[PDB]
């Protein structure tokens, strides 16, 4: 298995990704 | 040295089997076509899904660039 002392539930990575999208999706576009 | 000989032989011995394995329907008036079907069908779904998303977003980007 994995020696990853930390456990991360997928629901997070998904939501964290919805994060990158929103941020840059607006950080870039929607100028001004 | 010998190593190369054996390796070269194995390839030949295999080519021989390919000869025996065919009869059926070379392979079958349904088999081959199948792979292409499922394969193409799968690529279509993945490709189609990409098209939706993709192209609509491009229209907007251009129309607001």
């Amino acid at each position: 298995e994995t020696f990853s002392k930390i456990r991360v539930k997928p629901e997070h990575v998904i939501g964290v990704t919805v994060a990158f999208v929103i941020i840059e999706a607006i950080l870039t576009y929607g100028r001004f | 040295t010998k190593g190369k000989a054996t390796v070269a032989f194995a390839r030949e011995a295999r080519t021989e089997v390919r000869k025996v394995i065919w009869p059926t329907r070379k392979p079958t008036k349904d088999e081959y076509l199948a792979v292409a079907k499922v394969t193409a069908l799968g690529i279509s779904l993945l490709g189609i899904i990409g098209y939706i998303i993709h192209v609509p977003a491009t229209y907007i980007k251009g129309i607001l660039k």
Binding site: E1, T2, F3, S4, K5, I6, R7, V8, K9, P10, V13, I14, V16, T17, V18, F20, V21, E24, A25, L27, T28, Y29 | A10, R11, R14, V17, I21, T24, P27, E31, Y32, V35, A36, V38, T39, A40, G42, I43, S44, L45, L46, G47, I48, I49, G50, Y51, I53, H54, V55, A57, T58, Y59, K61, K65
Partner: protein, 442 residues
């Protein structure tokens, strides 16, 4: 002792021993798929709306898309895996995985490196002049986003890998190519139209429909492989009574042909990917170690001799160039292939158990099936080739698939077609495992 400290700091994915319904593995996969396509729609935050064309060579095997939140794509992950297979391959760092140690060592380790290669590539990309404006400030910002997007994939892969079907990478690649096709041919600036329109305009352009053909041909060719197949077996045995039938007969087959050299060739092509990148990079940022690019790609040097010819039409105007590449790829394939042995691959040991039960044994009755139980050598022998064969077989079909040249990437189409079929199989082994909650190993 090992890099266990930071290694234990690198997050992972919570694998539930709960009920993960087919319907859920499916629905999961799909969510990953979309976040992907989506990320491929979003440009990287960068004022310099002007970018120097594109690298028509890295995108395909990388499943990336330069200029987007995934401009680096699977590229790192592949790079990483490439090194590992290189070290743990040429014995340089001999390891007998067997033990959950070496196994989880080889892995965990590689994973880390993937994040290392995640940033490296990022920097290398911008440093290769993938965007044009090297505003130390803006440059930094970009790299951030870039490698971080690739990170998300690394974790999205993990998700699919433990919450859905098939594989992230495998998926991703097929995801990209498929799209690259459906869009290139039919999308906005679609080719089918550019051709169709060119017909209406009255100036029939054979160059607009061409690439579309290239792809059909390639598909039919790369597919021809997934056609053959034995048939098959077989076994036998009866005397049922275990308290409920037990007639016993014996499984069948066959299975198909190709795929094995899948991950291998993915690495060969990916090697070349990191050369054309690493050469240009270490070109407009140093000395011409690898080759003199100019014009974007390379027009001389190791780089030149190792640049796949595809795109639209096959290039005859350089025979020698062809020859070398081919041979160059071929051998590179044999390599990673061998390095896949020292590691792991389609093994008889494994097929032994499972090709020695189909039937019965037991007490009730005399159902035959002797098999079997000491006759494995019959596989490892008949086996060797199967996967292969290879660096020239698989590597050849891929390379020549590029001379011909096609939409999405001759080679890309290949992997895809395979990945897609190995993905169909996955969907079946599942549609069935969704019945008898046990035979999760037959």
């Amino acid at each position: 002792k090992k890099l266990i400290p930071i290694l234990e700091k690198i997050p992972e994915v919570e694998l539930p021993v709960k009920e993960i319904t087919f319907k859920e593995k499916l629905k999961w996969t799909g969510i990953v798929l979309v976040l992907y396509f989506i990320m491929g729609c979003i440009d990287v935050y960068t004022a310099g709306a002007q970018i120097p064309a594109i690298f028509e060579f890295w995108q395909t095997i990388t499943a990336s898309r330069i200029g987007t939140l995934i401009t680096l794509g699977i590229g790192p992950i592949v790079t990483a895996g490439i090194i590992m297979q290189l070290l743990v391959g040429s014995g340089i760092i001999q390891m007998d995985l067997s033990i959950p140690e070496n196994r989880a060592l080889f892995q965990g380790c590689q994973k880390l490196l993937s994040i290392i290669m995640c940033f490296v590539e990022a920097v290398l990309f911008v440093g290769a002049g993938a965007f044009g404006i090297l505003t130390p400030l803006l440059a930094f910002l970009v790299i951030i986003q870039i490698a971080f997007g690739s990170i998300i994939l690394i974790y999205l892969d993990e998700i699919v890998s433990k919450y859905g079907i098939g594989s992230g990478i495998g998926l991703f690649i097929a995801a990209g190519v498929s799209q690259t096709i459906f869009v290139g041919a039919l999308g906005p600036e679609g080719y089918l139209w550019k051709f169709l329109n060119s017909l209406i305009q009255g100036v029939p352009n054979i160059e607009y429909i061409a690439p579309i053909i290239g792809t059909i041909i390639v598909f039919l060719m790369v597919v021809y492989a997934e056609c053959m197949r034995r048939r098959i077996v077989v076994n036998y045995a009866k005397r049922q009574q275990g308290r409920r039938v037990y007639a016993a007969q014996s499984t069948h087959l066959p299975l198909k042909v190709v795929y094995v050299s899948n991950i291998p060739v993915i690495l060969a092509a990916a090697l070349f990917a990191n050369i054309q990148l690493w050469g240009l990079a270490l070109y407009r940022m140093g000395i011409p170690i690898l080759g003199h690019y100019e014009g974007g790609r390379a027009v001389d040097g190791i780089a030149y001799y190792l640049s796949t010819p595809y795109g639209l039409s096959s290039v005859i105007s350089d025979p020698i160039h062809a020859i070398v590449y081919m041979i160059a790829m071929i051998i590179t394939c044999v390599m990673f292939g061998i390095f896949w042995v020292e590691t792991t691959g389609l093994d008889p040991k494994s097929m032994a158990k499972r090709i020695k039960k189909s039937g019965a044994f037991v007490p009730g009755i005399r159902p035959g099936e002797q098999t079997a139980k000491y006759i494995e050598h019959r596989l490892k022998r008949y086996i060797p080739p199967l996967t292969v064969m290879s660096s020239a077989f698989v590597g050849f079909l891929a390379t020549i698939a590029n001379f011909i040249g096609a939409l999405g990437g001759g080679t890309g189409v290949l992997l895809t077609v395979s990945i897609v079929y190995r993905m169909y199989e996955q969907l079946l082994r599942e549609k069935v495992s969704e019945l008898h909650p046990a035979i999760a190993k037959l």
